[PDB]
Design a protein around this ligand. Structure first.
Ligand SMILES: CCCN(CC[NH3+])S(=O)(=O)c1cccc2cnccc12
Lengths: 350, 13
């Protein structure tokens, strides 16, 4: 066969140890999920690090400790109009309960009359997005280093019945050691089987989302294929100026590859960017192992990645604890707090 | 031709 006896036994024992790890991780997650911390004038606002329709994130400095954090600020009334109440409650609750080296850590959450706040570890290296657009594309080893972290993170999340639903370079921060921190859990959800919400980011949507099917966690594996393609090409596989045209290309499903893609990479991507759910990697009997044991990952030491012992291909320059040089500049908007409480009943559980 | 800037999420189609 492909593996000699010793290699086969090493890989089997490895896969059994993954099972043992995931069983304990689920114990810990459920305990925190069942039995889960600050206020605004505890922080100085420094700089907006990102902003979109579903909220904004600010660098803040904790007054007592001087530690820097990334504070997500959500407008309650805006969340209600956009029908994101449950999504925002999911984001806080999931972030509180998970624990993995490539998931950003939540430190505090609170609310006031107008807003909801989630205070996370500040990741100063910036978004993968910026670094990718600046350099153009990543070489295959560089892309593979990041991809491996996402594979492990999705193995972890999916074992807990959590779907992520917004993979994209914009949501992947680079930490001081060059490793990934996944941010923005606003579409994450605990899903045993099917779910139906039309959400995500157009270029990364699986066809079954666009086609309004009741879909499952395999949409995350499709999105991994989009991410790996974009990292290695510099642009995503279904690329067009407007969402309707992007959707048309996704549903047709015909992917074309740059001539510099290796055959191993193209084979992996054809099996992730697979319309037929009975054939899509990550959705088969062999589960995540179809991905981890693929030829394109043959040089990947999965334990060494998890342990953060692989030398990263890129170490961001770090000019100090509150340095923001790896982020772009955004128009700064006030943090307004009404004298009157808004949407108290909607957010009682937050 | 396609979108090279940061991409917003959608909440519906
Ligand atoms: C509304 C943009 C939010 N962002 C993610 C998408 N780009 S973000 O501003 O990059 C950011 C979010 C969460 C934690 C962070 C920790 N450290 C730095 C930034 C962080």
């Amino acid at each position: 066969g492909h593996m000699g006896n010793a290699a086969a036994a090493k890989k089997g024992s490895e896969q059994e140890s993954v099972k043992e790890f995931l069983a304990k991780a689920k114990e810990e997650f459920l305990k925190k999920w069942e039995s889960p911390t600050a206020q605004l004038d505890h922080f100085d606002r420094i700089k907006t690090l990102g902003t979109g329709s579903f909220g904004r994130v600010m660098l803040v400095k904790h007054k007592e400790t001087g530690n820097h954090y990334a504070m997500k600020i959500l407008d309650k009334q805006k969340v209600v109009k956009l029908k994101q109440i449950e999504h925002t409650l999911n984001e806080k609750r999931i972030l509180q309960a998970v624990n993995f080296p490539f998931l950003v850590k939540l430190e505090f959450s609170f609310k006031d009359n107008s807003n909801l706040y989630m205070v996370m570890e500040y990741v100063p290296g910036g978004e993968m997005f910026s670094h990718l657009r600046r350099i153009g594309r990543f070489s295959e080893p560089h892309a593979r280093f990041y991809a491996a972290q996402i594979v492990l993170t999705f193995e972890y999340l999916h074992s807990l019945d959590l779907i992520y639903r917004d993979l994209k370079p914009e949501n992947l921060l680079i930490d001081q050691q060059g490793y990934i921190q996944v941010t923005d859990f606003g579409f994450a959800k605990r899903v045993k089987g099917r779910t139906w919400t039309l959400c995500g980011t157009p270029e990364y949507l699986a066809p079954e989302i666009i086609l309004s099917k009741g879909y499952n966690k395999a949409v995350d594996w499709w999105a991994l294929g989009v991410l790996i393609y974009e990292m290695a090409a510099g642009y995503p596989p279904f690329f067009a100026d407007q969402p309707i045209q992007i959707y048309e290309k996704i549903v047709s499903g015909k992917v074309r590859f740059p001539s510099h893609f290796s055959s191993d990479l193209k084979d992996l991507l054809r099996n992730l960017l697979q319309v037929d759910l009975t054939k899509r990697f990550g959705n088969l009997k062999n589960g995540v192992n179809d991905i981890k044991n693929h030829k394109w990952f043959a040089t990947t030491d999965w334990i060494a990645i998890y342990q953060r012992k692989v030398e990263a291909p890129f170490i961001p320059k770090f000019k100090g604890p509150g340095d923001t040089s790896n982020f772009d500049d955004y128009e700064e908007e006030e943090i307004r707090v009404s004298i009157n409480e808004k949407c108290g009943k909607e957010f009682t559980e937050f | 031709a396609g979108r090279t800037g940061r991409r917003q999420a959608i909440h519906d189609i």
